[model samples]
Target chain A: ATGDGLFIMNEGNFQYGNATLSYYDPETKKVENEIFYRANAMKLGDVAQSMIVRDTIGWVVVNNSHVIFAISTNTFKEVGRITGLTSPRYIHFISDEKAYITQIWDYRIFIVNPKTYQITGYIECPDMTMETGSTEQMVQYGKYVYVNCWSYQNRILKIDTTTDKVVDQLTVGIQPTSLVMDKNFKMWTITDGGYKGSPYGYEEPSLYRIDAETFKIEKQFKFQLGDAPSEVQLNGAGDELYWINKDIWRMSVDEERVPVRPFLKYRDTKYYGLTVSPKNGDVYVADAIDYQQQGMIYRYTEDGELVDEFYVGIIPGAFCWK
Target chain B: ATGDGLFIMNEGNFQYGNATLSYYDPETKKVENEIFYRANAMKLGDVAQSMIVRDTIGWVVVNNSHVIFAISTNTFKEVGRITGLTSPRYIHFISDEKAYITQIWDYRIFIVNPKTYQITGYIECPDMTMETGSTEQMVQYGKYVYVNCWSYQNRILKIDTTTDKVVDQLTVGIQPTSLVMDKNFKMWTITDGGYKGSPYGYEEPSLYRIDAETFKIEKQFKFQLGDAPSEVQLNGAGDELYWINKDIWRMSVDEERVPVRPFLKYRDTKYYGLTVSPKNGDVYVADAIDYQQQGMIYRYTEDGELVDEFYVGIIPGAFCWK
Candidate 1:
């Protein structure tokens, strides 16, 4: 999983029913449009998007429904699934053939098998009481898995993905949106103002750095983007970090400078989900067109150079490079 | 100088004492060393060591002497007499044709002309009344020129290079060997631990991070290394921060996980005066052999791949490249 690569999700659901999973090549700068394999399955929901790729396998979550599809790199066919899932928004691969899926409606995590597609176990979050419109994202490194738990008890949950158990929970900010791991095994999370009634563009965002070993709050980096920065991803080199606030922003991890440059802009198109390709610095943003038109997927190089984009046919939700 | 490359001071007394203004070519992996023309006429001090190169000029304090010599990048000639210079140990260039030199005899600073090679003004040190020993390295960024006052004080003097004054001082550990600047304008100083009365081995070396704007202590990263950390430099991408502690280390700037990879070992003859080429990730270290043996300069690519080296025929002190 550490060295292998794969493709997951992007942009949004197109004119077709659900979003599709395609193959991406970093060295050749090529993408194979293999969106038909996952679309033919009748078990997916409206926003059956969002994916997490590990090594040669990927776990795709159907955002609006309770279904998780495990796909293999060697073969594009769906290997298996954990049925009766409740609106799993994002899936994070902890290893090459195992993943942790976050259930938005039930506030729980389902550990599933990538090779067999069966729910092996479930980690219950008794305190994960999300408010009206809140969600979370999880990041894994070493022996720990961190989750952005957005609720009245907003915090970062450190779980031992290796043991399939929770380790510690530290309170952070209001609505934790995106999470990333740096070189020191420290976890970085961002809060989008609050989930209650904060205007989409009213909240100031804050970046928190946590010590993975001590599970303590180490440092805080705060900045005021134009609007709600809901998701973020690191460039391939990891020196530059980019986040999406309607538009895409390029930020230096060590510098306090804000938005070195804007990678994208907010206009007529709806830009939401974002995932960075580690092979190249290309970023794929899932444009959940919101029923207005076919959801469009846009790709940009690490330097904000437009690469490629096409209609995904449906409203897309989440994205992860395989 | 921001536009022009850096300047080097050569010891004019020796036949190969000519100082070199070096520019690095990434493709060829070659450093074009330009020798100064008027180094001999100015009677430049012996051991043109511990130099700082700025736009249009370079400054070097002669070894074990208070005399400071200046060289213009444009003319390749020595500009005379930096007045009020007393045992000048280290020099730092803040802007085009401007620099700050530290006096080892007194805890004071001399502002000199980078182009004309003349002393323009001085900054008095009133708070730090401790005896001065040697200033090893200096870095200028934002409004402060951080001077590593080694030996006597073992502290970092935050001098307001803009106003040509000393603003604040932070007491770090013993033997503050080297310093670097992060993307956020924060100052990171490394305590090599040789003068602290510890054996040349791994003993929890500390890295202090200072806020440039407020001149306040921000955070610290303490880790163990093999022996004394001679120098510290950030990678060209700035994602990975590197330091040489007997062996070289590449730490992630995002603070996610500490990169345990050793860039070079102590026995790697090319592990002395270390510097990361700002133009590229290639690292250049002055591998000084014993006095009887001629020292050489070696280069390592971004991933720690040894590139090239040449016998420069003198004990190399510090180097700056364009």
Candidate 2:
């Protein structure tokens, strides 16, 4: 495996539970198969939702299987695993010593000591009710860790990183699924709203801007009644926000408007994952294909021109950079 | 056929122009067969996009056929037909003498004299470009007729009814398809966004509220990335708004909040058209069941309790009240 490359977290399939991690070399345009699975002598997990790289260690949140694995980035060997998680979705680190893990159908943010790979503490949302009160994506801004509650009562729980306590709750759009920090230090959140048959109350999806200083919602942007925007990420400098509604959309953060045009439109590709390289600003998109066969990872320039693509595992849903 | 009943406008298939108008009697709980076609000796034009009833006159906009048919609601007889249009979508009247008609792939709003059944004039959009510079649903608020241009540059074109010219163009969400006036007389527009794999740049869908007096966008609500909210309608009193997004959603217009729960959720029903009764607030939903075979129309209470369902023509897309 290459020392410097992109790592794809594959969600295999819920029915199969053969989750895997793949490494893609930009130089050769080839993907090394089952990097985590083969090196660890075990499957990644049921549904690998996302991964976070902190120095030489990588944290992979296996959603359905309810575990977080700590693996060496170089050897891809599982060094440790935290087992007491309820359907984890993502992991974000505020500092090298501490990280926060969000889970589906859970209102508590599981904190971990990344260096020791041990459970440190947990911060509970003040007003979480029903099974739909799930915590999704998270981001660290200043001294606060913002967690998106993807449920009927959509709120962003702000935790003081120093004290590791829930300090404030800001109401946002319905089913807030992801969070990202802009160049101005403002935190932006996107909601998927309620799904077609979700038990949670149906809602018009929306985007929200939270002022970093006051922790108040500065702007709220409501989408159409049913549009679902997910997999949101900011460019390297956080000048533009990229997301997928149907195709890829890149919106200028300063403009504060919906993207007029998509960055990329694929005839046969169904985009499910997206990430922007912090170093080069190259965009990586994952094509789930039909969710049955091997998926594809596509690399594109900042201007949305396709560079190359390679086959990966089933449902390549997230990416982690070396 | 009963004098007081619901008329279902069947769109049939786009390829095959076999559209029809059906009558469903609530008293007897039965739908009369082909009332308009049988009474008139000719089929309703292809792709019935919308129908409006004014006094005894029923106006049906046959989208693909590019024609609007005027019929007597009491006798179900064809009174007149206005031809020479480009993919007409909806017909909204400001008065008994004058009305506005929107057409797909056309930049101009065709003004018609409903009494004379003739096209009197047209208002061109200010920034019309692509062949898909199409005009969609319209709503009359006071003297201005708000038309949604569902094309590359999605905007709401405001036209003064007296002047019959485009007055102000307010940019709205992507593919703004339908317009409705709430109880407060504030104009609301919802977009289906761009369709998947559309040659037009795909966009995230959104909802917008325009101040009727100021003719400016008061609020813009965004939806999930891929969710397309179309067929928006206000309740009888205009107190609440209803639309189809997989399931039927009812939102409070005054509170300006998305519905917490769906009014109705049918496992097999794929809702295409929705309307609220002006007299009783009864809800009527048209199911385009796979877009083939004869579709079914369902009647429900304002609270979403099912009343009854009746089979109608292929792709029953719009409803006309009698």
Candidate 3:
């Protein structure tokens, strides 16, 4: 499948009537596919974030409820359901056999045996951490799961997947919202400057390099950027780390990098929630339009180039890869 | 002494700006006192909610951070602060020698012997219970602490304050925002219609009555007055439950009722975040003006007779008893 457009998860304001799903076509330059999976229709109340698998399967964690929906990726059918979860934020399919989900509101990780859709084990984030928003991302490198706890305490925990425990952790700054791991076992995260105005007045987005093997923060790259740096993801090639701010920029694995020549700038709208397709180097951006009309999804190239845009009529949050 | 006034806490957009404490003056029939405390001013991300202890000492938990401030009764001075906290939502002075703080984000309770301002003990909330949001009110009755866990998995976790462990828990509904205990040891909570327009929504706000001794959700009284019933409290004598749902309503605790007599009916604005003075039967309501300007504070008698309205410039959250 040629890199398909961004698969958007639409969570309307918390009621059962508001949550939905939408898919956009970056090549077609429009939201060619859309679906409304009424939160209550699935008997799930207030979903937090979802991850698409195989372009046909999606898993959503109900925000304030202890439930997860195993739904179809194409027809948006509710195939199965999982209960006994606690404010789960995001899920990752490490393989066809194993998957992991993080509870942003809690400190435990659910390791699911994907074949049976049953949680086989639980891992603790370690060091008693808290996240700002329910938008945590996890990446597995070797035997460790790199989890972003979001900068409430400004640290990331390294979970030993084998032992199902947080073995080590690294400290990031401000609010570390999202995380991405490279093929070489290097973890990267984006820290928000300050919300509206920084009390520190420090409007620089700091990028920290984590020694994935040692599970420690290796170095810090301070880049003077715009205000809030929301999400971070690596391109399909895994050669560049794309940090999506109100505007999108790229940084190198080893460099004091400014914007890459020209930056990928769009209409000045509040941009948040991001994801990248590793299959075809596609980028998806959630355009939160002042929280008015759901939001629009924009697609771009891995080379910091805008490809297309589509209106995915509900505020899209925390995109994931299949 | 008669009730001096009531403090109303208004959170505009949940980011800490447009947040102020408005005080309603019974004599002036107006909001005569206001104080502005932004999240940045307090060096925290956002001021979520608070609890008042005495004429000058109050505590507020900032969003995402693990810090609490103790403001002075006379000058609103930051006389002391308790750090290393984990997202505390409500703080209660159970006695002059001790206080209890609820950690809604971290799902734990910190017992502070206020005499030394030290967290002497912690009671962790049970895992996978789907309890989220600020653990609103922590009231000590007899030998237990009742905490309102906001949202669909609406829960009132009863902790044996003596042992510092959860004795029992009750699931009520979505967004059980606030809790108050009556004289009969019946714990009551108001469900704020569950984030109706956000990624979190459950059903409408309903009153849940739980037996304090058994920690069971015995009866749920559904009150459909507004979109979100944000707060609830008992009359001074504890015979009636006073709630604000666009309009104020008073219903006897011993009755099954609907359309309970309107307490404060207004044409332009709605009321929310109510506080009943324990010293007297005076009730205060947060009359939110617009999303930007500071809200007004209104006070009335136990029978719902409007007595005073003030332009208290700040959003009143909780009241201090001295």
What is the C-alpha DockQ of each candidate? 0.01, 0.01, 0.01
Once fitted onto the true fold, the runs of candidate 1 whose alpha carbons sit more than 4 angstroms away are A1-17, A22-34, A37-44, A93-98, A113-116, A129-135, A151-153, A195-203, A223-226, A257-261, A265-270, B1-322
lDDT of 2 by residue, B59-124 (tens): 888888888888888788888988888878888886556778877777787888887888898878
Put the candidates in TM-score order, highest first. 2, 1, 3
Q: Could you tell me the interface RMSD of model 3?
A: 23.9
Tens-place lDDT per residue, model 1, B151-215, is: 55567776654367767777776667777766555667777665344442224557777765456
Give the worst 10-residue stretch by lDDT in candidate 2 chain A.
Answer: A1-10
**Clash counts for all predictions:** 35, 20, 32
Docking class of 3: incorrect
**Candidate 3 — which residues are off by over 4 angstroms?**
A1-322, B10-13, B16-18, B22-25, B28-45, B60-66, B94-97, B128-134, B195-201, B224-226, B266-268, B314-317
- Candidate 2 Cα errors over 4 Å, as ranges: A1-322, B1-3, B266-269
Q: i-RMS values of the candidates, in order?
A: 16.5, 20.7, 23.9
lDDT of 3 by residue, B6-117 (tens): 4454454465444444345555655534343432254323554665655346665543446566666445556677777766677787555567787655566778877677
Error of 3 at A74 (Å): 79
Q: Mind sharing the TM-score for model 1?
A: 0.45
Worst 10 residues of 2 chain B by lDDT: B1-10
Question: Candidate 2 DockQ score?
Answer: 0.01
